[model samples]
Target: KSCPSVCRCDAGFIYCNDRFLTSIPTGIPEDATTLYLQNNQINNAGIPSDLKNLLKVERIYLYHNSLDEFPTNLPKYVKELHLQENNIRTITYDSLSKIPYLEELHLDDNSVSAVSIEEGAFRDSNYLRLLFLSRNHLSTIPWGLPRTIEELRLDDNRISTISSPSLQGLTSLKRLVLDGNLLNNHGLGDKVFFNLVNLTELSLVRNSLTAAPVNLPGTNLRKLYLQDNHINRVPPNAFSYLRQLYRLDMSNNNLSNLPQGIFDDLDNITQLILRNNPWYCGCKMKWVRDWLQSLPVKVNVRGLMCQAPEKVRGMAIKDLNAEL
Candidate 1:
């Protein structure tokens, strides 16, 4: 029936955020459902040896703290866990498996690395769906994630390579964002998308892709973003199988030409972004200009400027005459 002087408690919720707290205050409401302890200096040393007594606590916001462990003694039924913006260094298999009712987890901006985050993480949290591992020290994709996860964000990680089997069982994934990573054609071998049958949206923006990565999901994928890369050429059949793709972005690349019929199979495309690229408006490249105008569907097109052949230089590919 009492609250700590450092915290505010009411209606099954406790707010102890930004109190400059060096330790978790005692006397928290026993029946609280949500506990807000964000922006504190508390680490595992400040945590109680066991929180099993807080049976009603379902959501915990421990972000912006000094925690280095995955909340060792959270209630087994806690649904949402936020541990982002912390100085935590490691997350092993046992850290997250304890929360069986976890539906979402945010672990961004931590020091979790490839060797430290064991592949067996979340083995028991089969109900977890949303996961954010972005802005970490990971050099490769974490393996053996729960199949129930739908949206996975790995942006701004140190990931330069991804093994083929690292994504083996994560079939329920939909929005996979790996932006601002160090991915390249050599590290990202083909067939990385073989198991992601249900994937819809994929993002690989701001990577070191020398060429378009191959063997993407040929079905159900609608949005594909490969902007801000070093890709100079795309193979004829590279996107031939992406018949379901509705949006394609290849902006800010080194592309000068495309193989004829390179985009013939993109029957559903409505938005095409090829801006800020070095396109060559030659006889071989005349097809791209014609194809855009021939499409029965109105496409939201951007960038396709010519960068070569003296007279037609700096002109939009769509503005060139048919004299080629």
Candidate 2:
């Protein structure tokens, strides 16, 4: 009836959060299904010798630690491993392939500057569904990713260009986050996302986009975030393929006026964000004003002010008069 002195044992989980322990606790119950050892200073070399004895542990939370490398001897049945906010510098093939059932791997918020993945790093983990490598120093998408992955988050990284084979086998990918990168208009090619036919959500905020990226793979996109970029215009067919897309964010851009019939192809888009753009309220923009007024979507045109033709210099896009 006794448990590790540093942790609180509930039915089948161990909570060692914020305990400041320098090493993983020993004597974990064999039936324990989760181990929360986050917010500590434990290093990979400090993990107890017998820590892998917890065969039923399905999740491990080791974030916010001082581990300079990936830990070894993880439970074989672990489905989720969170190693974020750590000092891990590199990830290799042997780092995680032992966990055959690992479905989620979170290595974000770390110092991972170099990733040397072997082609078989994820070969045994066919059930892996999500991989979170955000807020790191990765300049490109790592290779050897499992095709079974559904949600891949690489936001807040230094990724500039998405090469051909970067996402080659991700046919089952649904949600991809690449926000806070350097992907300009030309950085993403027409077939860049062609393999992700099942993609439903994509985020590219805070990038160097000059215009909207085109040639989306599928029409099942439900949410798209392209805010905080340098996008200046939206081509008429920009979102033509996104017939099923419902939400979009295009705020904080350099767009002066959206092209006519730009949102015409978006049949299901209900929420639109177009704030903080240098909108020019001229006669040419009458179409946009009329479109905004008549569009069925719930658009947020707040702060959509004019910056040209001194006559309507400070006018809002929604307040344009028809007789002007």
Candidate 3:
């Protein structure tokens, strides 16, 4: 078969990436499995008709483009759609309801602030797994997400509160990243994460959180990052349910003290970061020293210096004696 003049075709893939063309090249083979059209100035005028020939295309890469809306003429077999680094502002039901087998959709690095799905935009897209909306302007978690989604990244946005329907049916979710948002303790109620029972990694870094997340669902969370917040205290047994946690980072906070045996239940934790805090070096710190020495994980105590007890103000917590 003669390959298209505008694109390089080999085996089952079409390569038109970085061609500097303002429109999608014509003559895409019907048997092509992948289409790469990234790094171009293609707008939304006549690109859909150019892609109507791809009947078996399984992947489409349109990243780094000037598309203001989601392209509507994708092949039904498309599993991975890369539209990141674009200018898309909204996602409605009509934008993606046709693609029933889409598994991974990358909408990150765009200007998307709203996603409309009044009657379930992804009602037919049941196989969708990974949805990336990071580096956008989204203020609230979008609704009508597929329940089969496994990983969702909504970080680097203006999201403040998680509504009840934000994570309604995401029971298969395993990794969720909501870092760099406006979320606080009050904004995240006790039941906000009650539906994420299969979660393993949860990142809330660079938020306005003043307290560690509590009452999380029954999940086998392995890594949790809550660094760079205003959290001053972690209630005792706050992480008792997360006995399977492996890595926990609470660095760069206002924590002064932790209850004894606060981490005794985390038997699988292998890494803990607690540097740069206002730690008081008094009788309340003896347990911390002992716990650090007993833990098998690689603890970071670089800035675990004292800030109390005039005599031991400059001493490190690890060097303090058992007595006050």
Q: TM-score: which candidate is best?
A: 1
Error of 2 at 87 (Å): 1.1
State, as a TM-score between 0 and 1, how close model 1 is to the true structure. Answer: 0.95
60-113 per-residue lDDT for model 3 (tens digits): 999999899777877767889999999887566776776888999999999887
Where does candidate 1 stray beyond 4 Å? Answer: 322-324
| lDDT score for candidate 1 against the true structure | 0.84
- What is the descending lDDT order? 1, 3, 2
Give the count of colliding residue pairs in each prediction: 0, 0, 0
lDDT for 190 (candidate 1): 66
Task: Write the residue-wise lDDT of candidate 1 on 214-252 in tens digits.
Answer: 777767789999999999889766786788999999998
- Supply candidate 2's per-residue lDDT for 62: 93
lDDT measured at residue 235 in model 1 versus the true structure, 0 to 100:
73
State TM-scores per candidate.
Answer: 0.95, 0.88, 0.91
Which has the better lDDT: candidate 2, or candidate 3? Answer: 3
Per-candidate local distance difference test = 0.84, 0.80, 0.80
